[PDB]
Amino acid sequence: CSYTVSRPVYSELAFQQQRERRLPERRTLRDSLARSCSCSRKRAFGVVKTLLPILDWLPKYRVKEWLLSDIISGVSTGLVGTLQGMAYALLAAVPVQFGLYSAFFPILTYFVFGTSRHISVGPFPVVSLMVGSVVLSMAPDDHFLVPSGNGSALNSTTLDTGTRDAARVLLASTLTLLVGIIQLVFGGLQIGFIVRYLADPLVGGFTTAAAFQVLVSQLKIVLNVSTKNYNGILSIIYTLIEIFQNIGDTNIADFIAGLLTIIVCMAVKELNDRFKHRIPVPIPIEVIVTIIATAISYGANLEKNYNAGIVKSIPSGFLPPVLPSVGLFSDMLAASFSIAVVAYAIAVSVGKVYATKHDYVIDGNQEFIAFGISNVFSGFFSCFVATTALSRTAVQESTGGKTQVAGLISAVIVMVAIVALGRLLEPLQKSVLAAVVIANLKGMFMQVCDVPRLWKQNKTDAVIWVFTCIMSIILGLDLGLLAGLLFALLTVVLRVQFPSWNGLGSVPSTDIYKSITHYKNLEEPEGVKILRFSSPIFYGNVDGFKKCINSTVGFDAIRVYNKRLKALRRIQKLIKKGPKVPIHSLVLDCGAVSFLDVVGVRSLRMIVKEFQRIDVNVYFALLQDDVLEKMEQCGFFDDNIRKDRFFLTVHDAILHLQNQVKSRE
Amino acid sequence: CSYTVSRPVYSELAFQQQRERRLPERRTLRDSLARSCSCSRKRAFGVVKTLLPILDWLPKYRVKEWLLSDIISGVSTGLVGTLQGMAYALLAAVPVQFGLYSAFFPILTYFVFGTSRHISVGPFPVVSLMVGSVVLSMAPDDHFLVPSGNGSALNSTTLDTGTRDAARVLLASTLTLLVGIIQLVFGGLQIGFIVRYLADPLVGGFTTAAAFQVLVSQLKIVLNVSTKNYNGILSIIYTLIEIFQNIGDTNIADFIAGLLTIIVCMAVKELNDRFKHRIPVPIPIEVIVTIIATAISYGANLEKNYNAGIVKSIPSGFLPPVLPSVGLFSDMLAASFSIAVVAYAIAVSVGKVYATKHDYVIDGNQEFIAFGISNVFSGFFSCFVATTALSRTAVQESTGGKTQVAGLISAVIVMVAIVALGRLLEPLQKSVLAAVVIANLKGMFMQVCDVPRLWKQNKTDAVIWVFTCIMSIILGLDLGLLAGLLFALLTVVLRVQFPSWNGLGSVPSTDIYKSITHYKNLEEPEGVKILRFSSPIFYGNVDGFKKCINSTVGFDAIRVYNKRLKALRRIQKLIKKGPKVPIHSLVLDCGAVSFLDVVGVRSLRMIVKEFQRIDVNVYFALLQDDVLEKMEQCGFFDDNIRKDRFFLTVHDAILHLQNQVKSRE
């Protein structure tokens, strides 16, 4: 209704005297360290409950229908998971059985330490691509070939399959151990704010570039062209040119099979997405298409007739645990860091989505610990990095998923696919597995249609998307993440270095002050000029603040004094011989400041001293208490600049100025 | 006096309707580019006035008394300049005759393009150290030695003086051209805000730690010990160990000579600063110490008797211009960048000190062009990077200096120091010139006494000082600047990622709201909780903003909704069989926000939606106009979240709630 107040004009001290402050909390380092370490059993119960979340949902089961739902969803997601694992095994330059291994052990590990319920832990295209890239970097093909075979002219230095793939698997296991150690370090130290720097446009551009690189790699695999695995700067462009110049060295059968399975998978996926209300359970297009491919590839001997590319290297068994070859972490520190960061980011995103969808929440540090333990356990059994694929976890949620027991049931499908079945997948074409990932790339390729939407929004975030996407294509993929985080931090610094200062004026017959560049009928006090400066002053925006003041007052506080001293000598010589007209006061409406960066309070005091020489009083309007407490310690309230110069509100300063000019002419 | 107002409670729209905005300025890309390029003759006279500042002070000279002081000061700083010029040449691993060139040619260029009047352009101890750091790297001593001399057992691969130091000059000259071009790029592209990132604690800790490297490097010349010029990580630490283990390989004559001039020059320096009011012109202690040292070294043949280290390599002449050996700029990109920044930083810092004292100002972008052309012109005559020494410019100012003509007169003293005199400095000991620089290091060594002062002030700035000082000691000196700029910018991101949120409450019988953790007798509205959050929300502090609200309301907006639906099933089953108590509204006092980072504004719409399900209204208090315009474009004002939810002031949000609960029970 009515907004009426009547209080005296408390500037800084008329309000500080009769208002008693609170006693600050004493440090008591000994007492603080003693009070932190609790001795009661309740804290132990709480930490053992939050560290092993299985003790919460397991005793509270609802077996009646949850058992059947988890059984069917686990069968479905286990088929999908073993398919995705045997497909992504090619992305890591490792044999196919290690994909089935990586689809089994992380699921078992994410059962007693996991805190989610709709997450299918396993392989991931981006993470597998990064692992394969670093494996090719630290173990190329030209470093294992042995000259043997009695060639035509020189030594027959053909391919040396065998110990080569073993070395690749060992390198991948060491990388996964390092990633798990880094994740466990991040979880134990409770540092979870390191992943907050991955903005949505940053991760979007990163996923787009990773999808482009995955498409290039899978096109290389489908076309069956021998590439020199170029890595470094412009590696994707180099390998694309190398593929385009070696098109003649392809396989027609593999090409047409890949095209057919691509179009079939895409059509069935879009049909299922369109007519979702017709059938609740999505049809496993990948399972039926790979079964049909294996069937048509077993009848006709495509390996001998058309010389197609099949696996024919599935051992169909388990492997004893192998100790990781520690000692190569020096050349994999940054790679493991980037891999762990992107894996945790994508996993937390998927978990938060499927948790807000199903009305629950997940913890960050617990997810970090669970993923670290899963990667450590997978590193001991020759597996690659484990994450959650949005396409794989979508099947488990659509078929109906209540808890991770469906994941444990999915591990039985991978179990039977390791021990007994799996030799039936011998004649399966490698181009078929290399195509289902491309069919799954449709989700990340559609993110390019969101760049025009971000441009209509804050343009600073739209540049981060394009910058991260382009930079993660030129200078590889692992350096693209570091080039995006630093660019995002630089953009944040630029938004606080070049603020949006205004010409704050008065509204008639009221007390609220609005900008003069946004409203027409606003008048300012006679002689007084109000200025608002957001983005609190630090060592970078000090010159910007000086320029803003000089532009809002019309002149320069230094040049006016220079002209005054130049004109004073003309008068000082006549005794022996024979600009700042409108500006009366400056009310700085520093209400959007948080810190002051004492290097900046020095410039503030310098401004106050300079404007005092030209008879221009500089006042303050909305300084917070946390800033005044810093200014008191930084040596600002001397015998000249007292607290009366500061004010509580913007209208109080104008009222004080009016009363002063009315009572003191 | 009295502060009384009476206005209706305009929330967002009751003030937007009857207040007409202003028409935004049209882009007019065709007209904006045409309006920028001026065609009037006054614009051409303006750009030529600032580019050549000599056309301002030279026609307006005051030869009546200015020319007299320039002559006495020019000879004063000229004798001190030719000494520091030849002494700092040892820091650049260049011969001593090329140091005199760096004190003559840059002065001629800083006469028609310079914008200062109390700056003595020439060598610098810190800058010459960075130049000599890259000369030893790309041209070490172990890369020019030739096996010749018929040694005892192996080939006599002794020192190869001659083409060795001759190649060092060409390498040093190419560096200055690249440094000069980079300074012209910043001046040409008008980008001058790149040097604003060098805070005072950053440049303070850098020059302090650089003084340690100068002390260790010059101690090598004083003790006359052969060092293996270790560079890279822990370079200063490694070279300090080699000197201490090779103390026996010293020169007693060079030791007692350097230790004597250290205590002599330092004592007279502090004695002159103490009794400053006794004599206006400071006595040239550095000039009287080198003439006496040369006299005693000329009488007694210290070169032959005591095997002392003398120069004996002064050609005493000029050299034709040499074209820069272009092609090594690839290995000097990071090297020239670090030198070009510290050259401009120290120049403007020293220039601004003597500018405010003598009542004048210097241009920022002009110093880039001024020092840019000087470094390019000096690169064509075999010189190193030119800057201004605080010790050298103090002599020119104390003796009385009005303009750069005193510097031009000093160039005549350097002129005669090349053509006629200079051979008299043949028996001058190298330890004497290596000690006059150490005596001047007292100014930067005293900066360590400012670390405790910064600790009582903002502690974030005190950590940047110690970090830059330590990091510029471990990983060399050029990487220390980059490691400090990134750490300083990272500290700004940390201060805006973890803000200082409070518990804003109401003051009795008034309208001002203060924090609850800073005042004792403050009451809050019944049910309403006010929260203030500085450091505007972006992709990093979005999770912290969630935890901030959850900490001030007592619960979590998601966990309460999880418990509600967990409890509603108990009620929904009884029909077929047979927390958020205090929180009424939330007023977010977002008055310290500048940008929104739409990535983060998605959470603001989520927060309003989350608390809406638990019957908790989330309002806003002090949202600025520049911020609300971002929400309109980013898709925030939908059919549910209207503008009435926002308010103009904090008290209007409370008045709207109090009037609502009374009229609507």
From Swiss-Prot, chains A, B:
List cystine links.
none
Stretches that traverse the bilayer: 71-91, 93-113, 119-139, 175-195, 202-222, 247-267, 279-299, 328-348, 368-388, 405-425, 432-452, 470-490
- Tissue specificity: Highly expressed in the kidney (at protein level). Throughout the endolymphatic duct and sac, in distinct areas of the utricle and saccule, and in the external sulcus region within the cochlea. Expressed in the parotid gland.
| Highest taxon listed in the record's lineage | Eukaryota
The record's similarity note reads:
Belongs to the SLC26A/SulP transporter (TC 2.A.53) family.
Sum up the protein's function in the record's words: Sodium-independent transporter of chloride and iodide. Mediates electroneutral iodide-chloride, iodide-bicarbonate and chloride-bicarbonate exchange with 1:1 stoichiometry. Mediates elctroneutral chloride-formate exchange.
Name the chain's protein: Pendrin
The source organism is Mus musculus
